[PDB]
Structure 1
Amino acid sequence: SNIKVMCRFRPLNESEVNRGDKYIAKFQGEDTVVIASKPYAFDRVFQSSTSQEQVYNDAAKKIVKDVLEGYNGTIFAYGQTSSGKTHTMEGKLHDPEGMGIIPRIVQDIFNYIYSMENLEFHIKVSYFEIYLDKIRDLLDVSKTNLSVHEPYVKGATERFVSSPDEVMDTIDEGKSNRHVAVTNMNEHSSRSHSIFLINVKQENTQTEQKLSGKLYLVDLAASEKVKNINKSLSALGNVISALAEGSTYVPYRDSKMTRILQDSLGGNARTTIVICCSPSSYNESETKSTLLFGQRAKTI
């Protein structure tokens, strides 16, 4: 498979420093993190002060190209509550430097569209949420328990978009709709998955050569138990382990999430998983857990 895992350590936060937490994360080359003297090796390791643009360039840039070249793809942020998942995928949406993966992907995609000649494009976006193994449409709050059919989500809103501005507006709209019938936003968002889909259609007007690529950009529920592992996250660990083994059968049916992502995760699809970590001594075992999860994808 074409699954890459990259590990991102964020800085110690204010509140970790108030306790006398130490920085337990040690670094060996550009692909290795060391914790309690155990090495953990990934496709890349991002140290605490890594810029938002370096994470983009290594995690995501090539997958855009592959989408524009007609492949499907997935990028995930996985990790503990407060580990940096949302900072990685979204970050400061409108800030040229604080911008996370999604808004950069949208900038690159359009830099390619606008730079073309006989090529015609249709780009459409969907944005939904998975909570308790159920799908809610984040663009239409009247659609709360959507079903997955043979791979598409029945009834999901799809919006045609002509500029990155309309994409970002669609995300901000989504982020706001997500508060509907939710009492506690952080709590809920750390307990659910948010999934953004860019579908990029191209037709060469003079050659009738058509291409389509889907890109799912997923900010996953928090990885630490709440007393089981979140259901989509166990499905996903099992899909990854099976791809890692080169199993001919992949248990996509283990969750609605891995059923939607079936044509975009494994096989011919491209996949980066950004595992996010806190460097704090306080979180040593959850971090170990996050690394362990990251390693399921190492081929055997």
Structure 2
Amino acid sequence: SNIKVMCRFRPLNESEVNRGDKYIAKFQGEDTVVIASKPYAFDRVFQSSTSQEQVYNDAAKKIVKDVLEGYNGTIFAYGQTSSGKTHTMEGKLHDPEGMGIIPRIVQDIFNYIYSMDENLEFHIKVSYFEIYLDKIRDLLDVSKTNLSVHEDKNRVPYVKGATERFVSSPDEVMDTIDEGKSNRHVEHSSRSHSIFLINVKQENTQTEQKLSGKLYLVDLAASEKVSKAEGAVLDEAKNINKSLSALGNVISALAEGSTYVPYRDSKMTRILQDSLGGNARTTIVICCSPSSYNESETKSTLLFGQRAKT
């Protein structure tokens, strides 16, 4: 099973306890979470006590290993405001124990590269864009709005004109991430799906053997609650739910072995076709707050976790 849905719970804020929130989550086995006598089964459920290194080892380590062998992988991140999503995916970048998934990914990639002999010429290309209101905006080039998706000789879709920078250090990769996040069209989150690609290219010298691993880190926009029709929030809601539904359809099709996988339903699932198909490894991580004050938000996140796969 190479398609995985994992759910991570977080510890309560101290202000949450001072506010008076009861722990509403019960845990069965290693993969079931019960919220008010309703059980939700996934591939893995990290309880509040599990560490960042554990989350990384269970969710992303094998995807990094595969991308270092020429294969592709994608990691989706979903979660309401203050559900720990940013803590899971980024964390305290400078704390080795409390750093999230992306710094660990970059660190393992470069630590691998520095352990190989130079008979393998390595290169790393980064790319960053966002689908906002169903428009592909390049996060590394603010003038590159409305990017098209095309198909090459081998029929694979690709985002024509997306900026790709060579990077040479984990510091440079996280700098690119900070720049891209700052270029978004605007902890309360934006209303767009951001997509960050790391491309490990490697040539073996005399055999002229070329391998190209693509690792996609996708930050999804969450389907939120109805809130008081002012501005662009309704447009955002329609587009976000359309894209999340298409993504769910494609993950279901690929998790069950469908001949008729609907990559053409949305743009995101056409960009990620070559990385989701081909028996590749995808791990959708959803973050939940166990507070009673976030019962509805957590229910929505859990139901999206179920709608994703099978």
Q: TM-score, normalised by structure 2?
A: 0.87
Q: Over residues 141-168 of structure 1, what are the superposed CA-to-partner deviations in whole Å (9 max), with x where a residue is unaligned?
A: 1112212111211111100112212111
* Partner-residue secondary structure (3-state), 1:30: coil
Match of 1:96 in 2: 96
Distance 1:126 1:134, change over 3 A: same
The answer as to whether partners of 1:81 and 1:223 remain within 8 angstroms in 2 is no
Q: How far is 1:93 from its partner?
A: 3.0
Q: How far is 1:15 from its partner?
A: 5.2
CA distance in 1, matches of 2:263, 2:18: 43
* Partner-residue secondary structure (3-state), 2:96: coil
Q: How far is 1:33 from its partner?
A: 1.3
The answer as to whether partners of 1:71 and 1:268 remain within 8 angstroms in 2 is no
The answer as to whether partners of 1:120 and 1:204 remain within 8 angstroms in 2 is yes
CA distance in 2, matches of 1:205, 1:285: 56
Q: How far is 1:298 from its partner?
A: 4.8
Match of 1:271 in 2: 282
* Partner-residue secondary structure (3-state), 1:94: coil
Q: TM-score, normalised by structure 1?
A: 0.90
When structure 1 is superposed on structure 2, of 163-172 and 107-116 the one drifting more is 163-172
CA distance in 2, matches of 1:128, 1:298: 25
Match of 1:155 in 2: 161
- State the percentage of identical aligned residues: 100
Q: How far is 1:48 from its partner?
A: 1.5
Q: CA RMSD in A?
A: 2.1
The answer as to whether partners of 1:244 and 1:297 remain within 8 angstroms in 2 is no
The answer as to whether partners of 1:124 and 1:159 remain within 8 angstroms in 2 is yes
CA distance in 1, matches of 2:286, 2:247: 13
Q: How far is 1:56 from its partner?
A: 0.9
Q: Over residues 8-28 of structure 1, what are the superposed CA-to-partner deviations in whole Å (9 max), with x where a residue is unaligned?
A: 011223554354321101112
* Partner-residue secondary structure (3-state), 2:27: strand
Match of 1:171 in 2: 177
Match of 1:108 in 2: 108
Distance 1:229 1:17, change over 3 A: farther
Q: How far is 1:71 from its partner?
A: 1.0
* Partner-residue secondary structure (3-state), 1:296: helix
The answer as to whether partners of 1:146 and 1:155 remain within 8 angstroms in 2 is yes
- The total of aligned residue pairs comes to 292
Q: Over residues 25-79 of structure 1, what are the superposed CA-to-partner deviations in whole Å (9 max), with x where a residue is unaligned?
A: 1112222212222332222111123222211111101100011111111001112
Q: How far is 1:123 from its partner?
A: 1.0
CA distance in 2, matches of 1:202, 1:101: 23
Q: Structure 1 runs of 4+ off > 6 angstroms?
A: none
1:179-258 correspondence to structure 2 within 5 Å = 189-225=189-225, 230-258=241-269
Match of 1:183 in 2: none
When structure 1 is superposed on structure 2, of 49-58 and 8-17 the one drifting more is 8-17
Q: Unaligned 5+ residue runs, structure 2? A: 152-156, 227-237
